[PDB]
Amino acid sequence: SDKLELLLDIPLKVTVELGRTRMTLKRVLEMIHGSIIELDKLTGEPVDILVNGKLIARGEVVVIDENFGVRITEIVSPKERLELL
């Protein structure tokens, strides 16, 4: 297709994230330079790789020289990949 081109083809937005947490809005307002917030992911376990807010993989952090990288260690198959968009 001439329009499916446009798509199988757009920059998607991949986010790799450390942890999450909830937080009373009060608490969020009190935070200063230097507060230590504690996430809920354990040191040992792999980090989340979500595309368009929807989680599709998990991996370990690497460093490609200058930048953080990620080596994928578990992925969902190319179906729910699509199904999660």
Question: CATH number, domain at 16?
Answer: 2.30.330.10
**What's the sign of the alpha-carbon dihedral 45, 47, 52, 57?**
negative
Per DSSP, the three-state class of 2 is: helix
- For residue 45, the one-letter residue type is E
Q: What is the span of the domain harbouring residue 43?
A: 1-85
CB 40 within 8 A of CB 20: yes
Cα–Cα distance measured from residue 31 to residue 64, given in angstroms and rounded to the nearest whole number: 33
Contact 13, 52 (CB under 8 A): yes
The count of structural domains within the chain is: 1
DSSP E strand stretches across the chain: 14-17, 47-51, 54-64, 67-75
